[PDB]
Design a protein around this ligand. Sequence first.
Ligand code: FAD
Length: 498
Amino acid sequence: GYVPAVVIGTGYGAAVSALRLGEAGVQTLMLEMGQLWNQPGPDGNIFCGMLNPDKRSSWFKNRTEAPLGSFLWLDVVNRNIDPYAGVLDRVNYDQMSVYVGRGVGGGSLVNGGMAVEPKRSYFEEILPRVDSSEMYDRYFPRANSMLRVNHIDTKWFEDTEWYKFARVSREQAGKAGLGTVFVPNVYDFGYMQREAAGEVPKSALATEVIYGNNHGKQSLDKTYLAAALGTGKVTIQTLHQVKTIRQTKDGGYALTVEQKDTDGKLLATKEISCRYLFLGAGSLGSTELLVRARDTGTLPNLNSEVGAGWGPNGNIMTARANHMWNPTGAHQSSIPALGIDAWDNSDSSVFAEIAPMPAGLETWVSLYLAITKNPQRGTFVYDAATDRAKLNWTRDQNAPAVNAAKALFDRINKANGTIYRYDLFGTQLKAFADDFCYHPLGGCVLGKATDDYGRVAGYKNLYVTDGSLIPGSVGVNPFVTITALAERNVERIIKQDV
Ligand SMILES: Cc1cc2nc3c(=O)[nH]c(=O)nc-3n(C[C@H](O)[C@H](O)[C@H](O)COP(=O)(O)OP(=O)(O)OC[C@H]3O[C@@H](n4cnc5c(N)ncnc54)[C@H](O)[C@@H]3O)c2cc1C
């Protein structure tokens, strides 16, 4: 049937948009292809942990996988599973695997909670058409508050065994003249203290994050989406995947929407129509919908920039072997708290999170997820044969990212007389994982495929809201930027268009 506004997806862009639409009195339906994660599973928990993965860990795979970096210790817990509507989806393209959340809340379900504002001078470089004063004066603060960002207590951090891994890398980086920064988070750090004291059920301190957190983490279902539902003007339908978008003959948009069960069985195909259509299906999902619509003739006026300008936020993973006298600890909080900020906007820039490892025994490994400045971009190209977008990115396009990460970590190795690990990412000697992405950015870039507020070029009342708007790189963990940009966009769209 018809609803005034439809929002596709329930990640950051979608959640912001729906809240503000509902507050404006616009009846809004959100369509989410994954589950509402609120049913206790076979262990009494909603989500599986990293040491006990089961079908809930994976979107339609037949075997669980170890978190990247952890195969040497966590392959032993891998098991065959039924293909199921689980929470984490590794999407495999030719030479890149992109990890995304599937469920009410999108990537907020599976992410590390790290809530980081980009450097203003870098924001100004990547998005020169956007007024940066309103972003920093109004929209970043708005996002910060709504997301429930909080800050770790420094004394507790310094003292606790759960962050020894972070302190070890801080000391090692310091010998190379590199400083660290605390990383704000949406995981409740007060709750985390009480986990360590045995006062509340553990989540971060029980090797949970990437398949969800049963406690502590303020994912979007608890923040923006709960508020959106609270308006009385928003509903969310789950296990509903939008497949096609067209402009109807009488105006507005019509969607074909597949309803499935958690086993992936097709239950129904529905036609849903609306006046205002907001895409929040992510960098991958929104871009796929639009290249499909262009190339199958259902939105024939979409421009040539739809699909273009994708990058992996310069994501590279690497690891160092510590000296025997610098163990990182058997007990590592699953939520990072420290990063190495070596980002000055030059081509050598690196902002690296000091990543915990889940092994639960001493390995002497320090793990890092580097964010780099690499100008290479890929393009999503629709394949009509399979009805899927393909990502034209080649592994050699990550060479500048590897080079920047390696230059930084080489400084740390030189200062400390340490070497890389070469065995964490497969049998072949490989110190730098260069074909994964947790932070997909672009495909429907702001000002290129859209106007400066995400209005899709060629169409009225058609909006993109999410990571597909960002031109490939933000220099930091991206969700705060996506959220703040979505606050800016929806406020303007409601004022001018609704
Ligand atoms: C392992 C991991 C760790 C991360 N850690 C951090 C971190 O600590 N901090 C940070 O800033 N970022 C982090 N990120 C990145 C962050 O989670 C993403 O940048 C963010 O979630 C993107 O928001 P979005 O709104 O673009 O899309 P998403 O959050 O990906 O949401 C898109 C939603 O749309 C749904 N959907 C897609 N297609 C359709 C369709 N056709 N029909 C219906 N529904 C659809 C999806 O199922 C999903 O729920 C991490 C991500 C991962 C995977």
